[model samples]
Target chain A: AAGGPSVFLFPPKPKDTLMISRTPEVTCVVVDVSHEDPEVKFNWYVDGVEVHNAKTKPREEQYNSTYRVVSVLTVLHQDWLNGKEYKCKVSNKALPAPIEKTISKAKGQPREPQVYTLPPSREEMTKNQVSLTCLVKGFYPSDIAVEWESNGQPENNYKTTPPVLDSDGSFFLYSKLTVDKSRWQQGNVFSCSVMHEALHNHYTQKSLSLS
Target chain B: PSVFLFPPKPKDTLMISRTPEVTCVVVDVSHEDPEVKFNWYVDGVEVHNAKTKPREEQYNSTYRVVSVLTVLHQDWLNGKEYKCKVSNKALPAPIEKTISKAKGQPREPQVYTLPPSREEMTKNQVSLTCLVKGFYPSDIAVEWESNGQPENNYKTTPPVLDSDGSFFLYSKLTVDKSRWQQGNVFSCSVMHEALHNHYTQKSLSLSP
Candidate 1:
């Protein structure tokens, strides 16, 4: 209660720029209440309004899938573009009153699944058998379920493979789907459908067409 | 003996280990409601549970319950203390974990790959860059040393974190040519975080 009239501002001097994807995603905001006395309590707010009450049963609250805690909050959907503002409020009975900080959101390139293939060799294949290995990269959370689709229909034309976790805990996935050479020559398209929580249950589809 | 009375003391404990990563762990729970929850903090900042886990398990660093602490490379092992608190509706007071601080690693100064020794005279400009490499979290400090004299003229800018969340530090020092001529034995030393004894040193000879 003796820290004088407090000013609301982001701690750590320079605040972090929030990077979020366009899809339905969970964005986390970290709040600091250490400026208050040990006996002082804290609460959370968003855009100038209180989201969680200090006296409530749940110190944290979740609404519209967004979660709020004593000094931290996670926004469920971040469809808003970069430069939007989010706020956190802290208070203590012994402290002066309530202090808060506002954070600005920065837009990052939305994440999407990418597919690549290995070039074929000079070895000729039979008219009805062609093998192609497709790769999907840069998916977050590393637990995505990917399936290959043919002409918008669920065909057994592909096999899903496990992802290779990188040194930073990210992932690279490889899946192989084989189709009859005759079907391949018909200008059919092969697609990889990636499903993850970040994608909001929507499948990211990548297609490859052979001449 | 009021049934709705809050517990006498906070029932949960929080622990932070700075060994491999800035990790937070919560332990113990005694509540009649059959469910109790713990919250973690780092440097007074609240840490959020990673999304992979939902059930809020205890002491498991994997997902859900524990929060990962991210510190700037130069700030790593910087002797910062963190704390945790546990709470439930039926308890009288929220329990808290023992407050703890991080241990910093000492850094060795950069060894400027220089030419052999030189003459000690005026009109000489010696340019040197201190490099500290091959350290985890890449966070370390660098300073210049001459003739066993440790000058407090070092600047206060902290090192930046690499893209991979590691520390990489470099400092360039230039002495006044009029005062410091050639043939002077110059050394670079590094002091890691707040660890006093973990200092490292590398030397170079300033030539004419």
Candidate 2:
């Protein structure tokens, strides 16, 4: 009861950007506001302009006995692409300042793939232990997948880190593969394949082989 | 091409205390070694009494290890520093994470309510919701009362932890609209470790 109301916006996953083609009919923007009182109002905006035609559905719920309401704004996908900015603002008596979640178009640019690799060391090669690392950098939207294969057979001894966000709003990932040193000594080929929406061929492959 | 492979790094330091008597700290690390070693220190002294769970296998043969250290609340409050150190042969350097009493205090929660929907109001069954938010340490209890007596026909959701380690919770109670219109007052009460003797409560009246 002491603090002001709190507001949260649940945009679609991959918060920074939304691919216009992949977005659904209506970009669902869920706004959740919590206050000590149930009486509250919500406003919708697109590109800083008020949206009069957007459909809104409000639901009332309790949080530890507090008054909370969740409002969903269904905005047309065309407007979401053209307007460039979308915001959900909440007003309540307990709020000192209205709380809002704004999404803008300038942050939704796609990025290209930058790939590199690291091969096994001589000591590891001699010990029958080989570890290969492939780093894919500067891709956007974070929904990228990486796969590993050796000699055309699927390799299971590979691990990939979750897409990590960079300072420039793009994402990077690291995938590593571990195999017996015999495979490397026998001239087996190791391949790291990356699948992302923004790629030209829908996928890219980088291979490493020891001569 | 030569690629440098570094060992896993410690994720974060987490401290949990249900009561003054039950308290522990946890450390998580991810690496490729199944036998990675973990050590706990309290006030610059190594602690032998600790527990470690089995390595959780991840993609790329990587393993995640979780270790816990148990200590008394008094020792924690007495200005003792807690540290979780991890080491593996693949690492260029060992990883060490530390925390102190300053980061483990409980925060008082704020509670509020919501009236039933128009559909429920017309169905002769009025549903009431109680929301609790902004509490720290994530462990809190909530109960409902009608006309000053304990009420039991209600459901409460699990506490959800936020990005900043605070918590949010909700509980709902449904009763006949006639009972709600009978000048009865419904109250929601909360019990937390930070508010030792006094609990927080908010009440609503149904009278027009």
Candidate 3:
């Protein structure tokens, strides 16, 4: 019977620094296995889509008579900027399933959040309420704080969504502030203020009120 | 021989002695004896620290067994795949499910808002209960509102993982009965990673 060797998958590591990169980055995933097994296999994927063009270097022998293999996946700067997830799966026929490792861009350059507010409801004689929505888009690292204000005072009655990962690796979310119908009828101001690391101690605020 | 990787349960309170672990629960097994087999793996490597609890008899004489695999937080952060495979004499092949940190496709949660109970209406403040169920990944945001105005006096319970790898929880909003006298529409809105729109909301208004 052939001896079964444990699978060791190293963390996905990039060649660049904390700052953003412009060039295609070389990321490596190493797998350790017993030398006796000649049929080890590797598969790689980015953003849940498999990429078959990755290159695997020759295996290096270890002191314990095991073999260490390296596989490099080239990731584009734009995808990394979007925070796409990269994954590596390794296996051998003798094992029951494959081992996997994943990594994503971290400690990245910040992109200031852009704020977009939808048109507030038309001013009517007597509606009971109004809702003002603010969309925060194209931010990185996913750290954000959204607050609502009414006439320059802190307003607690608001709903802010969890950050969603967008196609470009940036984060986006929504915050909606609802005010009393009489307040809007009286022409009061409602605001959505967003805070992000990219803003550097400042806030990106957008305000809307009834027509 | 069905196998399910128990969804990761995060600790919401302090002071409980806990370790990094992943649980795999196996049920509907026909066999109750030692002949049953459990295999735990990480990526394809077999792990030995797995413990199989004694099978409990269910209705129809089937058995429910659980296997807990001790894992480190580093494994989850590294996005490693932890799998549990099970086999028995009654099945032709083993069944397994893999648990990982990689974000999978989102599952929309079902939302429902319940009116205050008879006992609750007896109190000074009436509480409205919002139930969010059957969502994947367990991270969700819930808000309670009255006629579109956010209501902050609500408490949401930590998510409870279901047997099917989904999650459910309750958020109860307390409103002053005197202010909510008539025509106030109470709403519960839920947000999840899988939702395309901003959120799904359920509103309950009583008019007599």
Candidate 4:
């Protein structure tokens, strides 16, 4: 399984500068995002000092390891303080990144919603009528963007609905793409997609064709 | 002069042969008097005239003191019982023995029955068992065919041997239904290796 949108914080929000008596000590970190995507950027700070671009630094390693930005090695934050906050903000550069969302493990976050429409199992629908319904499941947030792409063109006049609640982060939406069966069969591809608010990206898409 | 002796034995065997025509032969007798003569009876009939015999030309009566019986059709002897009696007019006594024989019969072949396909759940667990019945123990073998090709998806348990030595074998196949539901066709076949060369077969498709 691929990662979803998530975050991890070490020495979380202390009232004052956090103290460290020893020169070399490993701090425990907590990843707090619901969707942890593989391509995410992590930034680390210590006593208000930008210790490393967590994305490009090697934070933890065993021995004699060369430490660099985005490297997995033990990084020594030189200016350690007694009650200061150490932030490790995790985020993904997903296109049209997630909107006003708490990047946590809770289910409702729409991180990577793979959306696509399938051909209706029954007989074809009629033209100029609400004939077919586009069912989109496994997405989060009731207002994710969904549209009908017929004959390589997006259909704007079709009616769209909010995502329905389901167990876990799973959500479903439906749209009336076509009223006539002939028009649906004549189209090339039909897809459903959701824009993630936190990742600034759109999830992988799902599609169906007439043939 | 050295003493000579011969062991005595009982006459128990009666022999008969038919090569296009029937002929009866008598090998040993236990009668003590030289004047004793053998009388043959067919189905309790006492035939005193030898000249009335049918197919008489095929009878070889070269041996001395041997009796020959001849008849036209072989079916005339069907369901008839024949035996010999030894009689000596000088001694005023007669003895007889009974003989036993058997006839033949025919046998029929057996057929097998099969069980229905079972249901399977997705992702976690799924298994199918194909059961066949009425097969004799020594002749049954279970087979698997999938998508028109032979498959090894099945694991067979040891044949269940019954009281009469006939058997029923169940071949079981299983898979992670979620993974296989991507669309697949599975088949199970039950075969009689010793008879009809794989007679009954069936198949089912997995749909999500």
Candidate 5:
């Protein structure tokens, strides 16, 4: 066979992106340089449960006729961030068993979270209610506590989402607290506190104020 | 003449970041009167936010009520005094009961189980004695196990207070002598509230 130096073949590589306002998605890419006309099937799983799959048509590369197929899978953002395992599987006529790759947050070093506070939008403030969103991202172990407070008093009216795993083996979480617009207009200092294992005092906090 | 206050028992109450509470239960009151009320105080100061439950009927003739004075777990352990007062029109004055955490420093017990004497073993039945001494807080339980099963025939004496403020007690398990000697082990386990465990064993086939 007249060929230059060849690279070793792999099963499939699964990659991810950070989850924002949408759920997380995993993409599976498999390259088959074995056959000229190959039929590749892609599959997806969340915590071992098979999810729906979307596969693209195989495109052939120029050198030595290498064929590649790409697949994408959208999974529950909450589940992915909460340390659930995700798997991307690929099958073809050239293999006996399907090739699979797994991804999750339980596989990496601890990364402390970065915290931010977002004030309410104009629409929210116009409705006589204001909301504050605390964004926490890039944390590991996924176990954390986000407490809300106004002027040193604990505030209970808040909604929080479970941690989502990030592409860099970290986490993303958000907690929103809504209050009466008149109360917020009084220019009180609001605090969003985060508790994680990696922190020195077991916690860190950020404050937001209209002033 | 009807209201009575009693100490709370060990409750397996699951909580979120909370210490166990010293609950006072008001019980055995005649239901033929106006609704009774409960007030709780800690260190002679009224606990304005004491959590009290609705009075429930016991056997339709007597009533029972409960109140919980949430003390900081550390303060309770530091032996703070708590009071419960019951008010009913039947009594001209409100009756009050006071309690504190069991006093005296915790002392671990040294337990020993002795086999019956030769003369005592002559009888068909033998009584094994478990000596538990040098412990604090009379809230302790002693039970005997044959091989592995617990025996109800054991009798444990009321904790005898020692001059050193610690306590000593004895427990006896009477069993058939012939039946116990055949490949059997008798163990006496003493469970104390403060100190964890003191176990002593006696058997023909085993030691200690």
Candidate 6:
């Protein structure tokens, strides 16, 4: 009960921004309570109205020698944006005033997909493998999805790091797909699909063909 | 004659309500040549007050000249057509790019922290990084606090503009491991126009 609880809304992650076609399944509000009592209650409100349909998940963890609890509220994106404010109220014996965190919608831009091959040109091909990197930069809301395809089929030999933040508060995501060098020599066409809300088709695809 | 100039690529359309605000349309005319100039046209009328920046050095020795046209949102709605015309001595003809508008809103940023590693903790030094991304208007404020006291031993990168006009930024706080082991709490706070009075903070702690 020594420290006050910290509360915040979980912002969209980098990959979440790539799915421009649809809204997020859930917007989360998290409250961190660092009291020894381990028992804490949470209330959710949208536009000054109490919300009871949200799902609450409580997690316990240790901070130094004290106990901490994290309470999360998972609500639909529609509910989150449809109101003027989304608030989380936390009550416990450790504090005088209930902790409140409110959030609202802000302006953002989802960027177009910038796709390219890793070697820049085909000359760097190692005869065994080649990589295609899809750079999705400058998108907002941090919820995006990047996928790869080879010759019209889903390419599974790929790895994408979590969305990385650029200096401008926009996101930069790189998903690299490595394929057999034989596929490269055979003129395999590799494509990257970037999904975000600001895109025209809900998604954009860029293709690279080996010459 | 060798091709010495690349056409400028104007950004996509950005439509806003009938509000009194300034919107800038940026066109990138990156080329190998240096003698390049730009002209702006709004609804067929040549604009004499367009702004131009020097050619920036890009990878592979290519140079990029960025031309910007700042127009009021009201003017944009009235003129309808905005264009950037580029000319250089190396080109046989001038290249033109048109600006368009779309109905949309800017997005607020989401912030998170990447925890310090065990190696960092063992070295008696803890470095914490906070990522602030996906916001618009390209401006934000970030700060670090130790146990609710503002700490100055931190470094933050300048706001970077995304191709989509949004912004991204990162801030790092490094402190002695002893302070962290002594149960000190470090918090990263972010402020933006979108959040209004509701700012955001993410915290870290280490205990003995």
Give the per-prediction TM-score of chain B: 0.38, 0.50, 0.50, 0.37, 0.67, 0.46
Query: Looking at every candidate separately, what fraction of the true A–B Cα contacts under 8 Å does it contain?
Result: 0.00, 0.00, 0.00, 0.00, 0.00, 0.00
For model 1 chain A, give the 10-residue run with minimal summed lDDT: A11-20
Off by over 4 Å in 2: A15-36, A51-63, A72-83, A93-98, A105-111, A116-132, A138-173, A177-198, A201-211, B1-208
Report the Cα interface RMSD of each model, rounded to 1 decimal. Answer: 22.8, 24.3, 17.2, 22.3, 33.9, 14.0
lDDT digits (tens) for residues B167-196 of candidate 5: 766565667877666646787776654543
Reference A-B contact fraction recovered by candidate 4: 0.00
List, residue by residue over B81-151, the lDDT tens digit for candidate 1. 54546454546787665334323343332223222112212225333445343344343456677888874
User: After superposition on all CA atoms, what RMSD does each candidate show versus the true structure?
Assistant: 23.2, 29.8, 18.3, 34.9, 32.0, 26.7
Q: Candidate 5 residues A1-211, lDDT tens each?
A: 1121122222211122232343445666666435533666667777888876544555555465666566766665446545677776767656666677877654456677767666664334556656666766668867677889987899987666566554555666667676888878888889998876556555788888774
**Tens digit per residue, CA lDDT, model 1, A5-107:** 2334332211011223432222223222233333334454555555553232233324423223333344433322333455655554544556656665433
Pairwise DockQ winner, candidates 1 and 4: 1
Clashes of each: 14, 21, 4, 61, 2, 33
Candidate 3: tens digits of C-alpha lDDT, residues A59-127: 777776666677777666457546788787877765677777777656787887777665332331234
Candidate 1 regions exceeding 4 Å error are: A1-211, B1-127, B138-141, B163-165, B192-197
The TM-scores of all predictions, comma-separated, are 0.25, 0.34, 0.32, 0.25, 0.38, 0.39
Q: Write the per-residue lDDT of candidate 2 for residues B8-45, one digit (tens) a residue.
A: 11111122324232123222333534356667787788
Q: Please give the range of 10 consecutive residues that has the lowest summed lDDT in model 4 chain B.
A: B6-15
> Per-prediction DockQ scores?
0.01, 0.01, 0.02, 0.00, 0.00, 0.01
Pairs that collide, model 5 = A81-A164, A81-A165
Interface RMSD of 6: 14.0
Scanning candidate 3 chain A in windows of ten residues, the lowest lDDT window is A11-20
| Best of the two (4, 6) by lDDT | 6
Point to the candidate with the largest DockQ.
3
The complex in candidate 3 yields a DockQ of 0.02
